[PDB]
């Protein structure tokens, strides 16, 4: 179902309390759904490996919108008239940052458990130093950026 | 007054409508999120401990 609407799902992730709540259920649905165990049970194995890599790229793009200096501008722009809506927007702003990432990171952890953190990655993991196309290769330094961002978002979430 | 009567009936109808809506939506999403968090916590903890 997430793939059958791949045009809309990728328009929401690339895009307010309502908007934040949409990002919540989407990522709450993604992480209980975006399981590569579903992939194997290659046209559909690459369609879904492209949707997963889009979720991961778009769930890291929310660490700089909510875990950065732009967290202050999203809270002050509602203080023109900060009703009980604006306070509820911020709770869903956070329930984005907390629930979207935990969900996605829990997915990452489950993936790791299933495959013993890529056991055969004895191949050098580190070097010794756009619309969805037909194919696109991912990056692995993305994991270190996710670590440096999650370790910096932990202290701000604490 | 017919106007008054009908208006009050409509108001009562709008009340029951918003009530159930809010109730169902809240409950459902609260459930889902909490379930997720609890599961995640427990699983992670146990796995880490066993791996240690």
Swiss-Prot record, chain B:
Location within or outside the cell: Nucleus membrane; Nucleus, Nuclear pore complex
Domain of life: Eukaryota
Family note: Belongs to the nucleoporin interacting component (NIC) family.
Described purpose of this protein according to its UniProt entry: Plays a role in the nuclear pore complex (NPC) assembly and/or maintenance.
Name the record gives this protein: Nuclear pore complex protein Nup93
Organism, as annotated: Xenopus laevis
Gene: nup93
